Amino acid sequence: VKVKFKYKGEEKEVDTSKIKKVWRVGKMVSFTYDDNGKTGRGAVSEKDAPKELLDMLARAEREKK
DNA sequence: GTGATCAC
DNA sequence: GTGATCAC
């Protein structure tokens, strides 16, 4: 599935399969991605986040340490 | 300010 | 070792 986001301003969308790290900053979801390139970075509202990313956040919220 | 990061 | 980013 895809998440569309703001960083800079050229608009963006990314397959959740290409998302390295996910975490919560306040009521915002922040993540890093890419592979062929640099580590891309993005964030979206925690309300308007696609269930999949939230699944990934939940995954990251239980990781030990 | 908040996490985590990149990019300088 | 600090600013710039991101949604509030």
Swiss-Prot record:
Keywords: Cytoplasm, DNA-binding, Methylation. It comes from the Archaea. Lys-4 was 70% monomethylated in form 7a, 25% in form 7b, and 20% in form 7d. Lys-6 was 50% monomethylated in form 7a, 40% in form 7b, and 50% in form 7d. GO terms for cellular component: cytoplasm. The keyword Transmembrane helix does not apply. It is found in: Cytoplasm. Highly stable from pH 0 to pH 12. One of its GO terms (molecular function) is RNA endonuclease activity. Belongs to the 7 kDa DNA-binding/endoribonuclease P2 family. Monomer. This is DNA-binding protein 7d.
